[PDB]
Amino acid sequence: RQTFMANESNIERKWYVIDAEGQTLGRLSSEVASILRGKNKVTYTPHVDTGDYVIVINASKIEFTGNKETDKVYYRHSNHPGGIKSITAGELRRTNPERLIENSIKGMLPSTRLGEKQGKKLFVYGGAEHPHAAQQPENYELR
Amino acid sequence: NRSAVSGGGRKPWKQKGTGRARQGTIRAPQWRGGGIVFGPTPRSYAYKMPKKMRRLALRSALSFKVQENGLTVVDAFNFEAPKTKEFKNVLSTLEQPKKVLVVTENEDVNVELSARNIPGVQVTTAQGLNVLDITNADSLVITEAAAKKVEEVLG
Amino acid sequence: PRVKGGTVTRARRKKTIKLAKGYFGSKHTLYKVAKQQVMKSGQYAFRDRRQRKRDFRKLWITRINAAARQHEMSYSRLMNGLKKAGIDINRKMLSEIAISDEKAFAQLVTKAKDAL
Amino acid sequence: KLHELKPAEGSRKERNRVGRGVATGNGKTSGRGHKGQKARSGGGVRPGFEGGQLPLFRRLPKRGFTNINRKEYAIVNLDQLNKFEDGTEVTPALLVESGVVKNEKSGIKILGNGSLDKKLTVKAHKFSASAAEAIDAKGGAHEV
RNA sequence: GACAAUGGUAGGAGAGCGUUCUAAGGGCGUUGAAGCAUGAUCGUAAGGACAUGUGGAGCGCUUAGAAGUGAGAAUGCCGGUG
RNA sequence: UAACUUGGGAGUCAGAACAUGGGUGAUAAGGUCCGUGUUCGAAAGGGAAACAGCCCAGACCACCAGCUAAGGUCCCAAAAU
RNA sequence: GAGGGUAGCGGAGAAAUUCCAAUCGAACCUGGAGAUAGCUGGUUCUCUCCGAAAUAGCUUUAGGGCUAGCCUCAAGUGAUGA
RNA sequence: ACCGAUAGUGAACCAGUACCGUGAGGGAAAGGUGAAAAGCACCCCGGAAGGGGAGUGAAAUAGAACCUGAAACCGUGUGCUUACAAGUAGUCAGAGCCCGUUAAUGGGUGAUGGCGUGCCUUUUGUAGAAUGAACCGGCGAGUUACGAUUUGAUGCAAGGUUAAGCAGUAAAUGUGGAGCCGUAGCGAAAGCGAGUCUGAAUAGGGCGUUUAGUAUUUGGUCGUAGACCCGAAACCAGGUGAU
């Protein structure tokens, strides 16, 4: 038995910033999820958190394909008899662009106790300005 | 068994209607104090074998005893009155082991009365020899008349 | 002769209750419930001894993939390149080298690229 | 010795007990099976048959009778007579004594199965054609 | 040493563990038997030892013999307790 | 690499789905009745989300070793954005 | 109200299968008696090898049985099996 | 080579008793101080029960509710862990925090990750919303007798073997040869016989000429006895009842 296991005594985390201008919604969300989990490190351990923090700016001008602007619909239920709501993806972009990105990425992470903690390291902002200057975020290009 | 245990003639309760297991008597095998099933019963354990094999077994015992130098041919036992100490000294003179079987031809009263309170000694005649007496005994002491009777009777 | 019980039924029932320590509630106290869980534990452990080998091979391959991507190539082309050269080092040793010796791994990625 | 006893090799075997756990192989149903007439206490049908098709010993006819004045003869073949010294006399009171006839049912009969090679006189109740010819063929006498 | 076989219900065949009593031999015990409790011990299984507490008088080993010889379930029987 | 003969001991006589050749029904039924193969029954493991009968494949035991079948390689989730 | 009579193959009944000790299409108790049950339920320790059937015939027979087919063990012939 | 207080008689104890029924009738539970009562003088809390000392005794956690004293269940104190989480409650991996063994690649707890719908019975098929079990403990189901057949062992062998009885320690085995199986079959029978029956005819055909058995006993199965255990609706016989 020779296998190395990472633990909280030696985990290192850093910050990244990614531009969401001119990218497809799903092609960007799949790449961000591989970073929050820590799939890009050589010390990946399944039962401990290893991934890094991600900042997403310019959450507007996120681009769809086809007729998704009007056809793609999001449903929710309030658990009351007869109450089901609905909203169009082209309507959520102009009124809550942060939730559009945030929910898409959170749908690509496991729903365990560790999955919720790993999803709390994503910050999404609709403009080009973010307030996390105390850290030293680095620019990241998408594969 | 069920029939021999005292009581238990009537049914304890009705067959159905109440929520309980159905029972017929209070002396069933599964009741406390009820009858026993498939238990001991008086019988005999004895059996028999061909006459020719009852004699082949006795000669085998005598031959095995002779093989290990456990045979002692002596003269007549000359006792006039029962006395345990004289026979104890006689046994110790001839260098005999703890368990000895002594064999004669007829019933010797003065030999059997003594030598019988000594733990480990039994007296027998020529027509009273056993497979168990010979095998249990450690050495055999016989008289010439008894030896001749044993040789002539057996074969 | 009559043969009764005692000192035989109690002895074997205590052995079962003693293998269930740490179990929740009545599953470490009562013999009948504990007996069932001890049988399920043996069935689980037989299955899990053979799933433990599939779980660790996956972990090594995930780490080899991450290290190789840092050298502008994927896992699938790395194992083909090593096979065409004859390295014969298994996934357990390649993972232990990438974590510890950073520039020894680069000595193996080159030969995997030399043979294409 | 009484503390070292040993029965002969292969002369004893342990009995099989049913209804004593599943590992023995005869645990629950004790070898009987599942839910039949042959799986109940008290057994099943009679050894011949009962019910159903007509039995084999009922669709066949009876045959013959028994004669109350039946006679059976203790037979002695020519081979069994060679044990006697040549020139001797054989009588029914001596065959029983010497160990050829054990039970004298209704007399002695001589049958001609074998070779004689003697010159002995034998007297018995019945003779066959071969027995009387072979006995007289080498010298001898016979009576009834 | 070389090769080959080893999923399994009804059911057939074989080899074993343990329990109470008897016979023969050989042993242990108030300087402490059986029983009970704990322990990180041994064997492929049924199972067997050892040490320490409690206990206050009987009990193992080897080879044979004979059985009222093994319990988780029958709206099972009796007692105690949720 | 089996088969036949003589002896001791049995269990079984409620079967199901898939494909295919037919009757019956209405070229209805997870219907029913026969012929021919497979699997379950009495079969764990991988695939089909879950799912006795479908595809792959038959578990003596241990290992933090390697190659494959069905089916797959953007994320959940191992391997081609 | 008191004292009496009719007894179960029976008695009583202005008649309802109504009553005869909280029970009546035939009272209760003790015996034959461990009645019979082709029907449900249950049947107690461990390993090793092999391993089915749900078909045919007949049956007051159809959720039962008997013979044949299929499984196992021991002995024999031995090439007759695929 | 019978039981040892759920056993053995229903009853080891003031048991046909407590109790139940109009009556006939049905019917339990309950053993154990110590070798010796030497069965706790005296002091303290309290109305008392109960207790803390002091004494008796080898021992009082042997103080009469008294040998040993298990499990269910009920409490007190403590090492590790738990208030954002969807659990057949375990298994594999695994940090952190405490201990130190029958000394060996040790023990206790468990932040997190992967996998995972109890047991039995009956069924073509059950996580099943089909059956059964509130929990713990004791008890609770293929036995024996006499016959048949087959297998292993042992003794004798064209022979093998005695039953009742008698003598003997309720034994072993002496004695006892009535009786039984085998050495020869075929035929309905008379009958003949290594051959017989059918048949006018060994003509053909059927069954025989193998011509090694026999006595005891371990194991398997069968039959007669309730025959692996528990469970009816009912039938018959003799009695008790009109409070």
Short mmCIF file of C-alpha atoms (C1' of nucleotides) in Angstrom, two decimals, chain D residues 8-16 18-20 28-30 32 34-35 39-43 45 47 63-65 67 69-70 75 77 80 99-100 102-103 109 111-113 127-130, chain H residues 120-123 141-144 152-154 158-161 179-195 209 211 217-224 226-229:
data_model
loop_
_atom_site.label_atom_id
_atom_site.label_comp_id
_atom_site.label_asym_id
_atom_site.label_seq_id
_atom_site.Cartn_x
_atom_site.Cartn_y
_atom_site.Cartn_z
CA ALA D 8 -12.25 -54.53 13.20
CA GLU D 9 -11.68 -52.29 10.20
CA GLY D 10 -14.90 -51.32 8.43
CA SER D 11 -17.17 -53.17 10.88
CA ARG D 12 -19.02 -50.16 12.36
CA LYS D 13 -20.79 -47.09 11.00
CA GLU D 14 -22.58 -44.14 12.59
CA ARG D 15 -26.33 -43.74 12.15
CA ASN D 16 -27.82 -40.78 10.30
CA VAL D 18 -32.42 -36.06 10.34
CA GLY D 19 -33.88 -32.71 11.35
CA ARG D 20 -30.68 -31.33 12.93
CA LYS D 28 -35.84 -28.98 7.41
CA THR D 29 -37.97 -31.51 5.51
CA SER D 30 -35.76 -34.45 6.63
CA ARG D 32 -39.32 -36.13 2.51
CA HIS D 34 -42.79 -30.75 -0.15
CA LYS D 35 -46.46 -31.07 0.77
CA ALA D 39 -44.69 -36.20 3.40
CA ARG D 40 -47.12 -36.70 6.31
CA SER D 41 -46.68 -38.65 9.52
CA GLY D 42 -48.26 -42.09 9.17
CA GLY D 43 -47.04 -42.80 5.66
CA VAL D 45 -50.39 -46.16 0.38
CA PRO D 47 -47.24 -51.83 -0.34
CA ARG D 63 -54.35 -71.67 -11.10
CA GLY D 64 -54.15 -75.23 -9.81
CA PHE D 65 -54.72 -76.93 -6.48
CA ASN D 67 -52.72 -82.38 -3.09
CA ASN D 69 -51.35 -86.77 -0.01
CA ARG D 70 -48.08 -85.29 -1.27
CA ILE D 75 -32.41 -87.46 -2.73
CA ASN D 77 -26.81 -88.49 -5.94
CA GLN D 80 -22.37 -88.35 -2.34
CA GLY D 99 -23.90 -86.92 7.42
CA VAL D 100 -25.49 -87.21 3.97
CA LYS D 102 -30.24 -84.50 7.42
CA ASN D 103 -34.06 -84.75 7.27
CA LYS D 109 -34.27 -91.86 -3.30
CA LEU D 111 -30.47 -90.19 -8.38
CA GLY D 112 -27.86 -90.79 -11.06
CA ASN D 113 -25.91 -87.52 -11.15
CA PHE D 127 -34.14 -95.76 -7.43
CA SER D 128 -33.97 -94.09 -10.82
CA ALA D 129 -33.06 -95.76 -14.10
CA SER D 130 -29.56 -94.27 -14.05
"C1'" C H 120 -38.41 -17.42 7.70
"C1'" U H 121 -42.37 -19.93 4.97
"C1'" U H 122 -44.88 -20.49 0.36
"C1'" U H 123 -44.38 -19.65 -4.74
"C1'" A H 141 -40.37 -33.12 16.76
"C1'" G H 142 -37.77 -40.14 12.51
"C1'" U H 143 -37.83 -43.73 18.47
"C1'" U H 144 -38.36 -48.92 20.12
"C1'" G H 152 -19.79 -54.17 5.29
"C1'" A H 153 -17.24 -57.39 9.03
"C1'" U H 154 -16.22 -61.93 11.41
"C1'" A H 158 -21.23 -79.51 1.49
"C1'" G H 159 -22.37 -78.05 5.41
"C1'" G H 160 -24.05 -73.97 8.85
"C1'" U H 161 -27.03 -73.27 13.44
"C1'" G H 179 -36.98 -77.65 14.78
"C1'" C H 180 -34.72 -74.26 10.41
"C1'" C H 181 -31.76 -72.92 5.83
"C1'" G H 182 -28.64 -75.21 1.98
"C1'" U H 183 -26.73 -79.78 -1.01
"C1'" A H 184 -32.04 -80.60 -7.56
"C1'" G H 185 -35.34 -79.30 -10.58
"C1'" C H 186 -39.90 -79.41 -13.64
"C1'" G H 187 -45.24 -80.14 -13.68
"C1'" A H 188 -52.30 -77.95 -11.89
"C1'" A H 189 -51.65 -82.95 -10.04
"C1'" A H 190 -50.59 -88.33 -10.35
"C1'" G H 191 -45.30 -88.29 -11.35
"C1'" C H 192 -40.41 -88.46 -13.31
"C1'" G H 193 -35.53 -86.77 -12.22
"C1'" A H 194 -30.06 -83.73 -14.67
"C1'" G H 195 -33.52 -83.28 -16.86
"C1'" U H 209 -28.29 -78.42 -15.26
"C1'" U H 211 -25.15 -76.59 -9.18
"C1'" U H 217 -23.90 -58.29 13.95
"C1'" U H 218 -22.88 -52.19 12.09
"C1'" G H 219 -25.45 -49.03 8.35
"C1'" G H 220 -29.78 -48.03 4.51
"C1'" U H 221 -35.03 -48.93 3.31
"C1'" C H 222 -39.82 -51.54 4.10
"C1'" G H 223 -44.16 -54.04 7.04
"C1'" U H 224 -47.20 -54.63 11.73
"C1'" G H 226 -50.39 -43.91 17.37
"C1'" A H 227 -44.76 -44.74 14.10
"C1'" C H 228 -41.68 -37.30 12.85
"C1'" C H 229 -44.68 -33.40 16.09
#
